Amino acid sequence: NTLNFVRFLELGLSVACICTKFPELAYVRDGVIQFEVQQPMIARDGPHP
């Protein structure tokens, strides 16, 4: 026997994730990641408060 072996890509697995690789490592614990905008708003009101 050989523990069952034909490869990485034979049904359906890679979107728990997306990616970016990360080789060089050795610097973070609880760093950042961003974006820079927010969520829809104001042209129904009165002349609202």
Binding site: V28, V32, Q34, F35, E36
Partner: peptide, 21 residues
């Protein structure tokens, strides 16, 4: 202000954040 030849659709570029050295 200079913001006037300015996007007319799905504005398609990049997004900033900060690897803290």
């Amino acid at each position: 202000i200079p913001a006037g030849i300015i996007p007319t659709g799905n504005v398609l570029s990049t997004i900033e954040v900060c690897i803290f050295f």
